[PDB]
Amino acid sequence: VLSEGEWQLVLHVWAKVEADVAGHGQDILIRLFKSHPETLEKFDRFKHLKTEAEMKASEDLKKHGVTVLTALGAILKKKGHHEAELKPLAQSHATKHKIPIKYLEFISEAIIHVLHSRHPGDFGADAQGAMNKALELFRKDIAAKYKELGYQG
Numbered sequence: 001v002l003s004e005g006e007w008q009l010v011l012h013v014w015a016k017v018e019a020d021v022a023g024h025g026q027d028i029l030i031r032l033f034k035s036h037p038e039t040l041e042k043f044d045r046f047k048h049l050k051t052e053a054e055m056k057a058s059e060d061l062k063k064h065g066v067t068v069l070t071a072l073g074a075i076l077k078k079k080g081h082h083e084a085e086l087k088p089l090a091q092s093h094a095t096k097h098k099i100p101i102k103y104l105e106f107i108s109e110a111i112i113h114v115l116h117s118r119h120p121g122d123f124g125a126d127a128q129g130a131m132n133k134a135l136e137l138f139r140k141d142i143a144a145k146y147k148e149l150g151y152q153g
């Protein structure tokens with residue numbers, strides 16, 4: 001579990017992310033798509049984007065960045081009591097989109113990378129450690145729903 005002190009660290013940087021969800025959302029997806037190109041293959045709707053410049057120019061891509069950060073932010077603010085928000089998410093991603101847990105690990109790393117880039121001041125080692133623990137909790141809880149459904153990993 002995260003301590004209260006750790007959740008405050010998490011939510012204080014997140015409040016900065018909320019100042020520009022679209023910009024953060026965009027960078028994180030692009031970072032994910034560039035680092036692990038196999039992830040882009042899950043999106044029929046983005047499978048035509050070949051360069052970073054095309055990715056950066058996609059308004060639909062931007063809109064998906066905001067969708068992802070918005071749902072994640074809702075989860076973070078529950079500070080661990082995210083059972084209701086997490087369930088519908090695990091179910092669609094497991095059975096519908098067919099996203100392996102590993103890819104969740106990949107987007108978590110993309111999030112951490114971007115935050116460090118846009119908030120070097122509010123994102124010190126202690127905050128990076130708290131953020132890591134929060135995303136690990138999220139993955140751990142999803143993984144468990146996946147396992148129940150016959151999809152573990």
Ligand code: HEM
Nearest residue numbers: 039042043045067068071072088089092097099103104107
């Ligand atoms: C931080 C973790 C992520 C969050 C919170 C999340 C959030 C969401 C939201 C809310 C939905 C749309 C509603 C729904 O279908 O359930 C969505 C749809 C979907 N997500 Fe994720 N997502 C996450 C990670 C991933 C990753 C890592 C992948 C692929 C690498 C993925 C692929 C998709 C797919 C393919 C759809 C359908 C998009 C479409 O309608 O074309 N998601 N995700």
